[PDB]
Amino acid sequence: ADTIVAVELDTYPNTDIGDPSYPHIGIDIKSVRSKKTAKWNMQNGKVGTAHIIYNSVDKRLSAVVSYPNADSATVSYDVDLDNVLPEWVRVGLSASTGLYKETNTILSWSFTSKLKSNSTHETNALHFMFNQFSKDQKDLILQGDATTGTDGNLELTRVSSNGSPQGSSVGRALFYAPVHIWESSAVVASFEATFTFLIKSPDSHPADGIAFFISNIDSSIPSGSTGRLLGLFPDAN
Amino acid sequence: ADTIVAVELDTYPNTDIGDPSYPHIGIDIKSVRSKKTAKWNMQNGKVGTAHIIYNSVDKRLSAVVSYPNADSATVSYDVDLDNVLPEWVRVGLSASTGLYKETNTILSWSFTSKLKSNSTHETNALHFMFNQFSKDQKDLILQGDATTGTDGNLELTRVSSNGSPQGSSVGRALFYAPVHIWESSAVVASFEATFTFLIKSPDSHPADGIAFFISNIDSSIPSGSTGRLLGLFPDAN
Amino acid sequence: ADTIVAVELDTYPNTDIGDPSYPHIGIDIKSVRSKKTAKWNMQNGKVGTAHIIYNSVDKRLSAVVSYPNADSATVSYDVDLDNVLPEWVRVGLSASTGLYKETNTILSWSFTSKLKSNSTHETNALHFMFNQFSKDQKDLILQGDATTGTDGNLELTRVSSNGSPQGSSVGRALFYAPVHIWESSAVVASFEATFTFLIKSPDSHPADGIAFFISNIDSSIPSGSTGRLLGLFPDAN
Amino acid sequence: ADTIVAVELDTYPNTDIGDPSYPHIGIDIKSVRSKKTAKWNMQNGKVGTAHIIYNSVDKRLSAVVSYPNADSATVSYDVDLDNVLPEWVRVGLSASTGLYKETNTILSWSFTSKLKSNSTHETNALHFMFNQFSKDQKDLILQGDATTGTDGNLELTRVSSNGSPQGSSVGRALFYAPVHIWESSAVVASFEATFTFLIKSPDSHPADGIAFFISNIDSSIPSGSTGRLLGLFPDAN
Ligand SMILES: CO[C@H]1O[C@H](CO)[C@@H](O)[C@H](O[C@H]2O[C@H](CO)[C@@H](O)[C@H](O)[C@@H]2O)[C@@H]1O
Ligand SMILES: CO[C@H]1O[C@H](CO)[C@@H](O)[C@H](O[C@H]2O[C@H](CO)[C@@H](O)[C@H](O)[C@@H]2O)[C@@H]1O
Ligand SMILES: CO[C@H]1O[C@H](CO)[C@@H](O)[C@H](O[C@H]2O[C@H](CO)[C@@H](O)[C@H](O)[C@@H]2O)[C@@H]1O
Ligand SMILES: CO[C@H]1O[C@H](CO)[C@@H](O)[C@H](O[C@H]2O[C@H](CO)[C@@H](O)[C@H](O)[C@@H]2O)[C@@H]1O
Ligand SMILES: [Ca+2]
Ligand SMILES: [Ca+2]
Ligand SMILES: [Ca+2]
Ligand SMILES: [Ca+2]
Ligand SMILES: [Mn+2]
Ligand SMILES: [Mn+2]
Ligand SMILES: [Mn+2]
Ligand SMILES: [Mn+2]
C-alpha cells in the first residue's frame, strides 16, 4: 500500500470512475478519483509542457499544462502534504495504455526542492535537470516498460520499432535519490517540477495519460495497474 | 506618482491609519493601509529572516517572517500583479524612523525571478545574492540615509558612530537592473525574495519598520515620508 | 580610455593587424591583437554555441565554440584579472561589419558570476539568463545599431527587413548591472558565460565577427570602430 | 578494485609513504601518494572551508582550503578525468584516524555537476546542498563510523558523547545518486564542490585527515584503510 500524490494528464475519460467527459488534468491524493480537475485541450502529435509547483506557506499544489501558442490549462488544490506523505519520498513520471494507446515520451524533466529550516535559516536543496537521456541512465529507476536512450528520450510505455504505441502498457521513472519533501522544523519547504512530453497517437482515441507523482521510497508498479489506473493505483476506489 | 507593492514589517502600530494594536507584517497595494495583515512577535535585538514568494499561477503573494527557534508569522493575499504593476519594475528594501526609532540593518538579501514564455516555453531569469555589502556597492541604488560597508551590512536608516538609531530617518536600497516582473505571453512567472535583518532599539517603543517592495523603475522616496509612511507612500490615504 | 578583455569570434582575417589567415577565436587583453588564437571552423548558416569560463584559482580564461555534431574550437590564456580590470565591470556582446558583412544574431545569452569571500566564506552572486529578447529589453543597454525584439532575437548589427546584413555596422549590448568581477578579500571568483549565435552571410567572405567582453562600467563604442575593430578598440596597436 | 580520485586534507605527515614533513592538501589519483601537494596551515579548532573545481576544457582539477582571516592553501593538477574514471560515479566525503585522532566534523557540503552536450547543446545538471544533516539522512550512504544528527553535523569518524575523538576510526558519506561525471558527446563538463569542516583535537598531533573523493558507484571502505589510508586506499602503493 503505497501512499501517492500525483498530477495526472488524463487523455482518456473513464466516466465510470468519476473522470469528466474529456481529456483533463487532475490532482490525486491517495486515489485515482482526482480531488480536482480541469478541461485540458489535449493536442496529439505536439510537444507540450507541464509545470507543477508547491510550497509550505500557501500549502497549495498547482499545475499548468500548455502547448506553444495555445491556452494553458490550470488546476490547483489546497493540500497539507505534511499529513499525506512520509518525510522522505521519491519522485517520478508514469504512464499507461489500455485497450487504447499513445506514445508516452518525455523530452526533458527538471525538479528542484528546497527546505529552509527553522533552526538556522539555511537551505537544504536538490535539483536535477535532464534534457537528454542516456541509454544507460544510472540515476533513474526504470520500472515496467520504461526505457531510455531512444533519441535521447524517456519512453514511459512500450513503443515498437515502427514508432507506434502498444496497448496495455505501464512505465515509471524515479529519481534514484530519496527527496526530503518536508520536515517538522522547516520555515518554508517547496518544490517545482517541469517536463515536456509528446503524446502521439495513430488513432482517434488516445489513452491513458502521463502523471508526475510523489510516493513513498519503495513504491513499485501495483500489479495490473495499466489502463485507467496509470501505473499508480491498485483499484479505482 | 509611484505604483507601489510592498510587504511591511511594521514595528509601530499607527492606529490613526489602520494599523492593528501590535507589531505586524502586511501587504500593501498602492497604499499604506494594508489590504491584509498578521500578528508578528517582533523580537528586538535578534536576526530574523523574511521570505516573499509569488507565482503567476495562484496569483498569490505570501510572506513569512521568523526568528530562529520561534513561531513564524505568515500573510498571503490574492493579487494579480499583472493589473497593479508595469512589466518592468525595480525591487528594493525600505525602512523608516519617526519620533521613535530602531536600527534597520539588513544582513543579506537574495532575489530570483523567472518568466517561462508561451511562444517558446523557455525561461528568462534573474538572480542576485548579497551575503555581504561592500562600502561601494555599484549594483545598488542607495536613496535617503541608506549606507553600505559598515561591518558588511546594509544600514537602511541612519545609525551614528555610536551605533544608536536616529529619528526621522528614511532609506531605501534598489537593485540597479530593472526586473521583468511579468509578461502577457508568459505561462508561468514567479519571484522569490529573502533577507535577514536586525531591528535593535535601545528604548521600548521601536518604530517604524522595514519593507521589501517592488515599484516603478524611477521610484524615489516620497518627500517627508518618514515614520508611519515607511519611505514608500506620500500620504496615509 | 576603456579597459577591455574579450573573446572574439573573428570571422574575417585581417593579416595587416595580426589575424591569422583564417577565421579564428581569440583572447584580447587590451588590444585587437589577440594574445592567443585558435583555428575555428566558422559555419555560415548554422546556430553555434560559445562557452567562456574563468576562475580565480587557475587564473585562466578559456573559451569553447561549437556547432551540433562538429569539432569544437578551444582557446585559453592564463590571465590574472585582478591586475587587468577594475573591481566593478559591465559585460556585453559586440559585433560589427566593414566592407564585408554577416548577420550577428544572438538567440540567447546567460551569465553567472560568484564571489566566495575570505572575511566570511559566504558567496555573493549574480545570474541572468536571456532565452527571449522583448522588443523593449529594459535590462540591456543597447549601443550602436543593436536592436532587440526581431523574432525574439538580439541583432548586434544592422539587418534589413528583408533579412539581408548591412556593411559598416557596429553594435553592443551590455547587461544593465555593474558586475563585481573580483575583490581582494575573495577566496574564489568565477564567471561563466554562454551564448548561441547565428552568423548568416549571403556572400563568400563573412565579416567581421562577434565578441563577448568585460569592460569598465561606462564603456561605449569607440569612434570608427566598425570592421576589424569589432566595436571594441580605438586603434589596431 | 576501486578507481578513486581524491583531494586529501592530510593532517598527519606520514614521511614513509611520500607525505611531506607537514600538514598538506593533495591530489590523489588512484593512490594515496599525492601526484601534487601544497603546504596547509592546519588550524586546530577553527571552522575551515574547502572548494574543489574541475572543467573539461582546461582538464584541470583545483582545490582551495581557507580559514576566516588566514591565508588559503591552493593545489591544482592537470588530469583528464575521462581516462581515469568511468562516466557514472558517486562522490562523497571520507576521514580517518589511527594512533592519533581528531574530530572530522562536516558542517556543510555542496556539489554541482553540469554536462553541456554536443548532439543537443542543452545541459544536464545535478545539484545537492546540505547545510543541515538530519538524524536519518536518507540521501547519504553512510559507511563505517559516519553518523548524522549530532548537532546537525556529519561526524565522519567516531566521536564520544564527551566530544573527544577516537583512534582507529573510519567513515565515509556518499551521495545516494550516481553522477554522470562525463560523456564522450560532452562539449563542456564541470563540477564544483564545497564543504566546511571543523578539525578539533585534544593533543598536539592530530591525524589523519578528511578527503573529498569521486569513485566508481559501488565503492566501499577497503579493509584496514584506517589511519594513513583515509578510508580510500587498500595499500600504500
Ligand atoms: C472500447 O473500449 C472501452 O470499452 C472496453 C469494453 O467495455 C473497455 O475494456 C475499455 O477500457 C479499457 O481501455 C481504456 C482506454 O485505453 C482504459 O482507460 C481502461 O482502464 C481499460 O483498460 C474502454 O472503456
Ligand atoms: C508618542 O509618539 C506618538 O504620539 C505622538 C503625539 O501624538 C505622534 O506625533 C507620534 O507620531 C510620530 O512618530 C511615529 C513613530 O516613530 C511615526 O509613525 C509618525 O509618523 C510620527 O513621526 C506617535 O504617534
Ligand atoms: C577587399 O577588402 C579588403 O581590402 C580593402 C582595401 O584594402 C579594405 O578596405 C578592407 O577592409 C575593410 O573591410 C574589412 C571586411 O569587412 C574589415 O575587416 C575592415 O575593418 C575594413 O572595414 C579589406 O581589408
Ligand atoms: C607514533 O605513531 C607513529 O609511529 C607508530 C610506530 O612506528 C605507528 O604505529 C604510527 O602509525 C599509525 O598512526 C598514524 C597516525 O594516526 C597513522 O597515520 C598510521 O596509519 C598508523 O595507524 C605512527 O607512524
Ligand atoms: Ca482516464
Ligand atoms: Ca506603523
Ligand atoms: Ca577581423
Ligand atoms: Ca598522512
Ligand atoms: Mn482522470
Ligand atoms: Mn502597518
Ligand atoms: Mn583576431
Ligand atoms: Mn598525503
Side-chain angles (χ1 to χ4, degrees):
Chain A
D2 303 320
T3 308
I4 281 184
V5 179
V7 161
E8 59 181 74
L9 285 56
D10 225 313
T11 65
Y12 186 85
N14 267 80
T15 34
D16 355 77
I17 63 170
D19 261 348
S21 42
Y22 42 65
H24 51 287
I25 78 183
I27 294 186
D28 299 341
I29 312 302
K30 277 138 55 185
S31 162
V32 65
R33 296 177 193 264
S34 303
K35 302 299 197 188
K36 180 96 81 80
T37 65
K39 194 163 187 302
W40 164 37
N41 238 287
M42 196 260 341
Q43 288 193 219
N44 160 63
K46 284 206 179 185
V47 173
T49 303
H51 200 253
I52 295 114
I53 57 205
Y54 169 89
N55 69 86
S56 105
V57 179
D58 308 336
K59 287 172 178 303
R60 180 188 296 201
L61 178 67
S62 323
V64 189
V65 176
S66 52
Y67 298 96
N69 298 108
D71 302 301
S72 67
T74 289
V75 83
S76 326
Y77 184 76
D78 284 50
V79 61
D80 201 328
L81 301 191
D82 292 37
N83 302 337
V84 170
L85 291 155
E87 50 182 299
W88 289 95
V89 293
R90 263 207 181 93
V91 308
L93 288 180
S94 175
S96 72
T97 53
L99 182 79
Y100 288 123
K101 63 279 189 173
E102 77 206 1
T103 57
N104 289 113
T105 319
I106 299 298
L107 298 165
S108 54
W109 181 23
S110 168
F111 173 95
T112 314
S113 156
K114 295 155 190 150
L115 273 191
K116 271 139 165 169
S117 241
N118 238 312
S119 302
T120 54
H121 289 160
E122 302 185 329
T123 291
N124 285 47
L126 174 96
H127 170 78
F128 59 88
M129 189 181 339
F130 294 122
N131 271 267
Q132 248 228 139
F133 294 100
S134 289
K135 209 175 178 183
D136 191 28
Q137 190 84 46
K138 298 187 175 311
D139 52 4
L140 280 188
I141 288 182
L142 298 163
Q143 296 179 336
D145 305 349
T147 41
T148 54
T150 316
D151 293 271
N153 297 335
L154 168 62
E155 294 272 26
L156 287 174
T157 61
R158 219 192 292 179
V159 184
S160 65
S161 297
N162 191 69
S164 188
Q166 297 278 257
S168 306
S169 193
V170 144
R172 287 181 167 201
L174 293 71
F175 189 60
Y176 207 89
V179 187
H180 203 173
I181 211 68
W182 72 259
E183 188 171 344
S184 277
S185 308
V187 168
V188 204
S190 46
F191 70 79
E192 173 185 341
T194 308
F195 66 89
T196 83
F197 53 78
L198 184 50
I199 293 175
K200 186 176 48 194
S201 167
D203 59 43
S204 65
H205 293 284
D208 267 75
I210 313 168
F212 166 77
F213 74 93
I214 304 172
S215 57
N216 56 296
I217 290 181
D218 53 291
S219 179
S220 21
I221 305 184
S223 307
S225 59
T226 68
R228 79 218 181 128
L229 291 167
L230 317 155
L232 311 168
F233 314 106
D235 46 56
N237 295 148
Chain B
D2 303 341
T3 313
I4 280 197
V5 180
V7 167
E8 82 200 51
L9 277 59
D10 207 330
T11 62
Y12 193 90
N14 272 93
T15 35
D16 322 88
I17 54 177
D19 266 7
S21 51
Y22 42 71
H24 51 284
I25 85 196
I27 294 185
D28 302 351
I29 309 301
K30 290 135 71 176
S31 149
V32 67
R33 302 189 200 247
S34 301
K35 298 305 211 177
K36 186 92 80 80
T37 51
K39 194 162 191 310
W40 174 36
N41 253 266
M42 201 258 324
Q43 286 196 229
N44 176 63
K46 284 197 178 179
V47 188
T49 302
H51 307 256
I52 290 79
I53 54 207
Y54 171 84
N55 73 94
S56 169
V57 193
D58 321 317
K59 299 176 182 306
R60 203 208 262 220
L61 174 62
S62 332
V64 197
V65 177
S66 53
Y67 287 107
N69 282 134
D71 294 278
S72 56
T74 291
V75 67
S76 355
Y77 185 77
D78 276 64
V79 54
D80 198 350
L81 297 181
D82 280 46
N83 304 321
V84 177
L85 298 158
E87 36 192 291
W88 289 99
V89 306
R90 258 193 186 108
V91 288
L93 298 179
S94 176
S96 74
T97 45
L99 195 69
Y100 289 125
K101 58 287 177 181
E102 71 195 12
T103 53
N104 295 56
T105 311
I106 296 297
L107 303 167
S108 73
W109 177 27
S110 160
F111 176 92
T112 309
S113 162
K114 302 159 178 142
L115 284 193
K116 277 116 173 180
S117 221
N118 184 238
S119 305
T120 261
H121 284 22
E122 281 163 42
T123 283
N124 272 50
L126 176 80
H127 166 83
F128 65 84
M129 178 164 27
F130 291 114
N131 257 281
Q132 227 218 165
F133 297 100
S134 294
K135 84 294 187 181
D136 184 29
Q137 200 80 56
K138 296 195 166 306
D139 49 16
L140 293 193
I141 288 176
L142 303 165
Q143 300 179 340
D145 307 351
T147 20
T148 56
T150 311
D151 286 272
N153 306 338
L154 171 52
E155 295 282 18
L156 282 181
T157 71
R158 196 192 296 215
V159 175
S160 46
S161 294
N162 188 62
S164 193
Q166 295 274 275
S168 303
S169 188
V170 159
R172 287 190 179 178
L174 287 88
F175 185 62
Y176 206 96
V179 187
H180 200 170
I181 213 85
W182 71 258
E183 187 174 333
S184 287
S185 309
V187 179
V188 206
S190 53
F191 72 78
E192 181 187 325
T194 311
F195 63 87
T196 66
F197 51 83
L198 178 60
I199 295 173
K200 192 164 44 192
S201 190
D203 61 55
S204 56
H205 292 284
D208 274 71
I210 301 165
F212 157 80
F213 78 86
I214 300 171
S215 57
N216 51 308
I217 289 183
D218 53 89
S219 181
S220 46
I221 310 190
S223 301
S225 64
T226 62
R228 337 125 79 214
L229 301 186
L230 310 154
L232 306 168
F233 309 102
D235 50 69
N237 302 143
Chain C
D2 306 318
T3 302
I4 284 181
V5 177
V7 183
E8 61 184 72
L9 271 52
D10 200 337
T11 79
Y12 187 94
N14 272 96
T15 25
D16 330 58
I17 63 180
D19 271 2
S21 10
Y22 42 74
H24 49 293
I25 71 185
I27 290 185
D28 305 354
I29 305 292
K30 264 135 64 184
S31 158
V32 63
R33 289 179 187 272
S34 325
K35 296 299 199 172
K36 189 81 81 74
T37 62
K39 191 159 187 305
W40 165 41
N41 249 264
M42 192 283 316
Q43 279 193 264
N44 164 54
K46 298 212 169 187
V47 167
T49 306
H51 196 261
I52 290 86
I53 65 237
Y54 170 91
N55 71 91
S56 89
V57 174
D58 306 335
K59 283 174 178 305
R60 188 196 300 192
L61 173 55
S62 311
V64 182
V65 177
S66 56
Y67 293 94
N69 300 124
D71 283 324
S72 65
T74 290
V75 89
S76 309
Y77 191 72
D78 287 64
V79 57
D80 194 346
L81 297 196
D82 271 36
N83 316 327
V84 176
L85 294 162
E87 66 185 275
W88 283 99
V89 298
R90 255 208 184 102
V91 315
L93 299 169
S94 168
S96 75
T97 67
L99 186 57
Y100 293 134
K101 69 288 181 176
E102 77 202 0
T103 58
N104 290 76
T105 322
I106 296 290
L107 305 169
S108 74
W109 175 20
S110 130
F111 174 89
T112 310
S113 116
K114 304 166 175 121
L115 274 198
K116 273 109 173 181
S117 211
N118 191 1
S119 155
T120 68
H121 297 190
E122 291 254 32
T123 192
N124 262 30
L126 160 80
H127 169 78
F128 71 80
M129 167 177 13
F130 292 115
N131 268 288
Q132 252 226 147
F133 295 106
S134 247
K135 91 296 180 200
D136 193 29
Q137 195 64 36
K138 291 203 183 295
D139 55 354
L140 289 183
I141 296 175
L142 303 180
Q143 300 189 343
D145 307 329
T147 52
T148 44
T150 294
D151 287 324
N153 309 337
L154 171 47
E155 295 287 11
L156 289 165
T157 61
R158 198 188 301 223
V159 162
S160 75
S161 300
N162 158 58
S164 195
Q166 295 271 295
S168 294
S169 206
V170 178
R172 293 162 141 226
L174 298 76
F175 179 61
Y176 211 84
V179 189
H180 201 167
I181 212 72
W182 66 263
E183 176 189 327
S184 279
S185 305
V187 170
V188 187
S190 55
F191 75 78
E192 183 176 315
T194 310
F195 68 88
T196 74
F197 58 85
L198 176 53
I199 299 177
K200 164 175 46 201
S201 176
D203 56 67
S204 42
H205 309 259
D208 262 71
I210 305 160
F212 166 75
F213 73 87
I214 309 178
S215 63
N216 57 294
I217 280 182
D218 56 279
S219 179
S220 45
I221 306 181
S223 293
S225 49
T226 48
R228 75 196 176 159
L229 294 202
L230 318 150
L232 299 162
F233 313 96
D235 29 62
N237 314 124
Chain D
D2 279 340
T3 291
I4 286 192
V5 177
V7 173
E8 79 202 40
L9 273 62
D10 223 328
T11 70
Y12 188 82
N14 272 82
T15 54
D16 33 310
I17 61 166
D19 261 11
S21 46
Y22 52 77
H24 56 287
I25 82 193
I27 289 174
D28 310 349
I29 311 294
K30 266 139 52 179
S31 162
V32 66
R33 291 171 194 271
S34 332
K35 290 293 190 174
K36 179 86 67 91
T37 61
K39 190 163 191 288
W40 167 34
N41 238 269
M42 201 282 305
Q43 290 203 229
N44 165 71
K46 293 194 182 176
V47 182
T49 304
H51 203 280
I52 291 74
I53 75 259
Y54 175 84
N55 91 77
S56 74
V57 176
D58 306 327
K59 296 167 191 312
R60 190 202 277 212
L61 170 76
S62 308
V64 185
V65 173
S66 48
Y67 290 82
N69 317 116
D71 282 273
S72 57
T74 284
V75 73
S76 312
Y77 189 82
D78 278 61
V79 56
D80 194 330
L81 300 196
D82 277 42
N83 311 321
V84 179
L85 296 153
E87 45 188 303
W88 287 97
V89 294
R90 267 205 172 103
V91 313
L93 303 185
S94 174
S96 71
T97 55
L99 196 80
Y100 294 120
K101 57 284 185 183
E102 74 199 7
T103 63
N104 300 70
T105 319
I106 300 278
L107 308 126
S108 76
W109 177 21
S110 162
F111 180 91
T112 301
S113 155
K114 306 176 172 84
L115 272 190
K116 270 100 175 177
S117 70
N118 216 339
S119 314
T120 253
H121 276 215
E122 301 170 322
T123 189
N124 270 49
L126 167 77
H127 176 70
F128 69 81
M129 169 168 18
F130 292 117
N131 262 287
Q132 245 237 157
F133 301 106
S134 292
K135 313 192 176 193
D136 190 38
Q137 199 64 51
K138 291 195 182 300
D139 50 9
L140 292 185
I141 301 166
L142 304 168
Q143 293 177 354
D145 311 356
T147 55
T148 53
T150 303
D151 297 309
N153 320 319
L154 163 50
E155 296 286 4
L156 284 179
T157 60
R158 201 194 298 216
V159 184
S160 78
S161 301
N162 170 81
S164 201
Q166 296 268 287
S168 293
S169 201
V170 172
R172 306 162 146 210
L174 302 85
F175 178 65
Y176 209 79
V179 199
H180 204 165
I181 210 79
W182 72 261
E183 173 176 345
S184 277
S185 316
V187 160
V188 190
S190 51
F191 71 78
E192 174 180 308
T194 313
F195 63 88
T196 79
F197 51 84
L198 167 49
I199 295 187
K200 179 171 50 186
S201 189
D203 48 68
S204 44
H205 316 267
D208 257 80
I210 305 174
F212 167 78
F213 72 90
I214 308 189
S215 55
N216 57 287
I217 286 169
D218 61 286
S219 172
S220 24
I221 309 171
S223 302
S225 63
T226 44
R228 67 191 189 172
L229 293 190
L230 317 152
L232 319 164
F233 311 105
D235 40 46
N237 312 137

